[PDB]
Amino acid sequence: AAQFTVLSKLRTPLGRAQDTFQTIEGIIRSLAAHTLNPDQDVSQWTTADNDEGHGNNQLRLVLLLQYLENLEKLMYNAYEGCANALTSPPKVIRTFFYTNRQTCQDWLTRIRLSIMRVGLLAGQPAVTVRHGFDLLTEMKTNELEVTIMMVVEALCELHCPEAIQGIAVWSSSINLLWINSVAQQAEGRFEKASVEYQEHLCAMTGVDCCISSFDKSVLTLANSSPEVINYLGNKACECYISIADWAAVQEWQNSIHDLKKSTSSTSLNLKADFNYIKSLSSFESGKFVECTEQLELLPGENINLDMKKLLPNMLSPDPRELQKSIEVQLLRSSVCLATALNWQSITENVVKYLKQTSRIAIGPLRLSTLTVSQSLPVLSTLQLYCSSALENTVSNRLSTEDCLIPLFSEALRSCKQHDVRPWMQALRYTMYQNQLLEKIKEQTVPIRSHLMELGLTAAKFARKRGNVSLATRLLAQCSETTAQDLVQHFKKWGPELDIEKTKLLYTAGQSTHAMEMLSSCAISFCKSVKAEYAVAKSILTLAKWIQAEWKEISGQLKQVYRAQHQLSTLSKNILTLIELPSIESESTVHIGVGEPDFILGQLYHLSSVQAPEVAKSWAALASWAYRWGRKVVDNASXXXXXXXXXXXXXXXXXXXXXXXXXXXXXXXXXXXXXXXXXXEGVIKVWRKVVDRIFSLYKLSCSAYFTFLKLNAQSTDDMIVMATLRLLRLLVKHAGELRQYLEHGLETTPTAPWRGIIPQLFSRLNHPEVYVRQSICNLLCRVAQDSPHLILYPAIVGTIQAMMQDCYSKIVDKLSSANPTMVLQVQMLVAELRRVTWDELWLGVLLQQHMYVLXXXXXXXXXXXXXXXXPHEKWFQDNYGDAIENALEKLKXXXXXXXXXXXXXXXXYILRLEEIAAMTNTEIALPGEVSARDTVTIHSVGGTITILPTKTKPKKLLFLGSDGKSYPYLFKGLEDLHLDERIMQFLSIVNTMFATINRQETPRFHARHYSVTPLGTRSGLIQWVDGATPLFGLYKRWQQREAALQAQKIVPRPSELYYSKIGPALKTVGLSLDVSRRDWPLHVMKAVLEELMEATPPNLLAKELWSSCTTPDEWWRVTQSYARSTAVMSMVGYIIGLGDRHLDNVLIDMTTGEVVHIDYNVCFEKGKSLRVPEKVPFRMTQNIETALGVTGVEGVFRLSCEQVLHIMRRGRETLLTLLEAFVYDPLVDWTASYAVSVWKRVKAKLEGRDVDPNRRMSVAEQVDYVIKEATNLDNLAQLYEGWTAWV
């Protein structure tokens, strides 16, 4: 319909060009006016004939909004045009829409205000948000406050606090400090939001509008126009209604009435039916007698004592009204059932009523599918489930398990992105059944356990958001306004309830009381029956809390330690907990280990021994032991004395004792030192003393092995770190703890060791004997049940003898199962290496000609001819005179003629048959790191294409078992060993975002491909499809502009830049002959400013907007793009990736993610080029505009801060991986440099990027990096090909 309207010059049968606009404007204005006052009764939009027309009304409104959006997209594409998204319309349509573009823009701007209201009424915040952003952008020159208010409300409905904060910061640069309150409310903090609302209203009105609430200090520690006043009041009322605080609602209403009477506002009025609130309060309180009377006044069908027309007439299409009606119907059915009970007497009608209610409640769910939303409403889903539960309980009388709500504790680890409102309805409908259970004599289902579990989960959710007021109520209800009140009121689900109470007390501020209660709970749990998930959790929480307040609890630990070798409540409680009867000795920790730190180790050890089935305790103990062991080892570089004295039967004794532990080939050095000092039992003494000062590593290794054995339950990032630490221990100190590794590596599984395979292969040349054998055995074992992981590297390395026997043994062990596959893969590798003649001859001739201006040339020619002796035969036959010509000329035009002929013949498409061809192969694809079921190659592409503007890249195509096309790309004469390590690093980094991705709509992921080397110079790089480069948009825009200017090829970036830098330099007094370094800064800045004023910044934003289908999809892709851009920018800044031109950045129109291509200029390599670059990443005008009207102050800044926090928290594993990459004999860094690169990366991660000793914070670092990447002083002095103006 939209296409027909646009293609028909707006001459639809509805009327003329202006008639359609007038009709749409009138309908939109009527809806907008009705939105302000519900008492309007809009014809054909608010009145229906039955329950079927109500859903149709909302459907029609949604369709109208979609039609308007499509119309706008088509008009924009008609007068401006797109690139690779929509086809260009005919010339007549473009010439007609180009002249009448101003009228269309004016009409859209005039109706945008009403469109926002209409979108808000239909429960479609995406439409109003997009329209608001467009309106704000168009207003570049008193309707500014209303627009911000509507956009803020819409964002709050979408649960996007980052966007709200960004808009607040953006608007602060133009009185509007109340936006932060809505931002906080969007996160689920109702108490803080309400308090802030009251404070703002009191400060803006002038009169005290505060109401009774919880302590302001405790609440904070835990977490002038009439329109603004009305909005704040309504928001506060809604906030109180959400937390189900009837008393607070009544107090707020009284305060509002008093304020209105004492201020004569005459414009403030709460838009909330108080009758419904009173009914809800009466129903929840158990007074059904008053509830029925209150319900008798609500509109709709009368209470049950006709079925199709249940909803009342004159109902607005607002989803809130529908939800209220559904809730009223459910309450009516519940009260009717309760009164009838105290079987087909009063059940024939209730069942029908509930059935109709359930059928009507499915409307929102069905509407959500009409658009690409990727999610379902929570309120509607819960209402439907509650209706179904009631329908089942009325017919079963609570006799089956289907009468309960499916909300279990499993949502704790999978529904962390929802507020506490979802559980309010569940608890409201569950308490009713619990109370009704007392009026049933027959056997029923156990609802007490379900009610307790549901209440506990809700309490945890409320506490996590700072809702102390609601959390206290839930805890009191499950257990059946001052800080001391909680302390004096709290101090199968027993352990969970106790832990929740302790957590609530700690969140309230009383940390000492919470810690003491947790210690007592742990003491009582240690003597329980199971004590599996309770003792470990309590000990871990207590240890974490103690670690947080280390400064304020340092004395208690010392006192406990002193008492243990010879006090406050916590001190004695911890002492009793540690001395609990069921490895660590004080003598070993007596050197280099602090007294209070030993308590943490004891706690971890006790938790591990008490709960050996959990992996968290083992990991914590291993980390603590490893850290302290490394510290004591680094800082270290009566029985012993008695043994030495007895074996040596005053200065001599002191010298011997000092030499025995001086700096513990070591045996020879010790013997020589002892002989030179004194002038054999010293060896035994040294061996016994070295083990004591080297015992923490043994415990760390044992704990790590045990933790890994349980993962054959934890995140991948938590396992990779352990594997890396174990490898480092086995590499650095191999002979000191070889006994533990000897049996440890002979029983560990191979599943968690598949993430450090390249490191294992690179560490196959360790100067040892058993270390090499152990690594080889581990790799061989890994080959079994998983041969597609070490197949390619082994065969590649096979084709010093240390790196030869291991490879031979690995290939021999891997070939004992499927020898045919091994031989076929070897043949394929050989063919690929041999398919990397004409090019070699051309290169040799060019090099010889360039170096000509002798014996070297003759030797090179002879060697090339000897090496070169389907396609080879043809080349040899057509160029068989090269040898004869060279021999004749040896005693030189032949070389020039051959080079010219080769160059002329060079100027693509090849064939696989001419350069063998297998089928039904069993060889794995090149790179299957993430593949549950390996896919074997089935065929090869018949033709191979070549790519220009490069050395020699060849694009191919492969087929798998599932008939899927997997293209690749060849790379010869260019080592790709560093790219593999970079990709591995990126994968490890992405693994850290697995936890944060469980409660966030935009996933934190960094797109990357897989690369595999085929020796020393060859290489196969994966091909990523579906991504479009950013340079295409600029090229298309240039072509469109040229075509438009022609009526009334395109220049390259270098030519365009020179056309502007020439005249400027000539006018300033200089010339083009001057060096680029000696160039004025003002000239470059002026040229850049003039160039940016010509390229519009909507090339990328409009592209993404036109590539979508519905507003929800547009919002989702926009958020995903912003998050992806922030993640990529932070990763590039940390690594130091440079040369990020438009051809090295690709955008995915399907999801909006950004992916890089050339990972060559990295590790701060662009600063040493001919034209150094100082910008950390690409923050061009188009990139900034594509992030929204806010820019870099909304989701971009918050995402960058979160990414930096994640990277800084786990920088140990990243540093270890980088160190391993440095000591890699297969990596060619030059193409002490590696040490410098590692030091730079470490400095960047530690926050000391540019500072002598000051450590910049995350916020400061983000601000400095953003400022350094956006200042015009750095973008002007850059390479021409970087395209800094687009």
Ligand SMILES: CCN(CC)S(=O)(=O)c1cc(Nc2nccc(-c3ccnc(-c4ccc(NC(=O)NC)cc4)c3)n2)ccc1Cl
């Ligand atoms: C419009 C023209 N294009 C953009 C230039 S494109 O190539 O044709 C194209 C590319 C993709 N995406 C894609 N996917 C996988 C790989 C590559 C790719 C392309 C070129 N070079 C490399 C490369 C080269 C060298 C190194 N290594 C070192 O430099 N030092 C060790 C690493 C990588 C990788 N690109 C999608 C569509 C299109 Cl059309």
Ligand SMILES: O=P(O)(O)O[C@H]1[C@H](OP(=O)(O)O)[C@H](OP(=O)(O)O)[C@H](OP(=O)(O)O)[C@@H](OP(=O)(O)O)[C@H]1OP(=O)(O)O
């Ligand atoms: O209340 P819980 O359900 O037991 O959640 C806790 C904890 O919550 P608290 O921060 O309130 O103590 C953290 O939950 P999130 O902050 O991620 O939402 C989480 O990780 P952190 O403690 O590091 O923040 C993790 O604790 P841990 O990682 O130490 O195991 C978890 O504990 P459980 O997973 O054992 O339930």
